[PDB]
Ligand binder design. Structure first.
Ligand SMILES: NC(=O)c1ccc(S(=O)(=O)N(Cc2ccc(C(F)(F)F)cc2)[C@H]2CNC[C@@H]2NCc2cc(O)cc(O)c2)cc1
Ligand SMILES: [Cl-]
Ligand SMILES: [Cl-]
Ligand SMILES: [Cl-]
Lengths: 99, 99
């Protein structure tokens, strides 16, 4: 399937037993999700961009379901204005940019 | 081309006769470039990033070449961690997400 970019490329994911809407974000190194509980150890991280930085909790080896694809990777949890699926998981589902 | 996401999707762009590095960023609605001189009048725009909202300068109908593909459209100028090619211009060059 091909996704055009006339609008934000949003998809539904399942993470930690919850459904969430998230943006397929090629500019994002990492996957970043709004506040929620995840299992396991975590460590703090700062990530930044336009408007400054936010503090997030880094969880590793988290399983996410994206469009029927199961993938495992790191998830950063914190006060992001939008849930985003970053390259660390986009690679796992074979997502590419094409033009 | 087809661009995988194991590394940041950095490409060369040309704007104002000069080559710059920029990121193909499906999570950015707009195109944001580091401080440079562009022609014409600008107008104000507020954009929201990961850390909050900021004011940038909006220039319209700016010629910009992205990986050799010619685009003409809105370019915002302001403090950004990297030059960002957002959906407004990704759509112009026919860029899609595929998996
Ligand atoms: N309205 C818009 O057009 C617009 C919206 C948001 C932004 S942004 O916040 O600056 N930005 C871009 C970004 C790209 C690359 C980097 C890098 F420096 F880490 F490489 C930071 C931020 C977002 C937009 N898409 C990628 C990035 N996502 C947030 C993010 C930041 C980060 O440091 C690490 C991550 O894993 C994820 C910019 C523009
Ligand atoms: Cl990862
Ligand atoms: Cl691959
Ligand atoms: Cl435009």
């Amino acid at each position: 399937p091909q996704i055009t970019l006339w609008k934000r490329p949003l998809v539904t994911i399942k993470i930690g037993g919850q459904l969430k809407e998230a943006l397929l974000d090629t500019g994002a190194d990492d996957t970043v999700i709004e506040e929620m509980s995840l299992p396991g150890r975590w460590k703090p991280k700062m990530i930044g961009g336009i408007g400054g930085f936010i503090k997030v909790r880094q969880y590793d080896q988290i399983i996410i379901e994206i469009c029927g694809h199961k993938a495992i990777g790191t998830v950063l949890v914190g006060p992001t204005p939008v849930n985003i699926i970053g390259r660390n998981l986009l690679t796992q589902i074979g997502c590419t940019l094409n033009f």
